Amino acid sequence: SISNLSMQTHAARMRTFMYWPSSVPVQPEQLASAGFYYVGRNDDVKCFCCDGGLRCWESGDDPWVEHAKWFPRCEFLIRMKGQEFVDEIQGRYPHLLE
Numbered sequence: 202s203i204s205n206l207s208m209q210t211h212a213a214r215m216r217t218f219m220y221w222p223s224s225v226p227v228q229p230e231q232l233a234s235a236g237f238y239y240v241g242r243n244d245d246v247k248c249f250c251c252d253g254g255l256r257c258w259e260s261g262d263d264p265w266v267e268h269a270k271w272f273p274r275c276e277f278l279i280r281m282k283g284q285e286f287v288d289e290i291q292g293r294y295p296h297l298l299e
């Protein structure tokens with residue numbers, strides 16, 4: 202089941218980015234679409250579904266890819282991007298989370 206149901210909508214996730222830092226190259230839209238909302242602290246975001254947090258976003262970061270890198274069994278991730286996408290990311294980073 203879903204970890205944070207108040208953040209299940211894209212619109213709700215999007216509202217959380219009001220004070221999103223300008224230093225941070227990734228945009229709210231790409232993050233919100235990947236299931237992530239802002240927790241109000243530095244560049245910390247959390248997935249509404251798996252409750253996995255990411256931070257320290259770098260230029261060129263793709264939120265979906267970072268999602269599959271660290272929380273590959275998130276169901277929202279798998280439903281939206283599919284098990285192939287996730288397997289590919291994991292096969293390319295086989296020794297993260299080992």
Ligand SMILES: *CCC(=O)NC[C@H]1CC[C@H]2C=C[C@@H](C(=O)NCc3ccccc3)N2C(=O)[C@H]1NC(=O)[C@H](C)NC
Binds near residue numbers: 258
């Ligand atoms: C994105 C810029 C930045 O903050 N970089 C690194 C730091 C991330 C955030 C702090 C907050 C706690 C700790 C952390 O991430 N803990 C999770 C964890 C780590 C290891 C095992 C279990 C849980 N943070 C950092 O590690 C922190 N790192 C540093 O400041 C490093 C030591 N120096 C650049």
Ligand SMILES: [Zn+2]
Binds near residue numbers: 249250251252275278
């Ligand atoms: Zn997730």
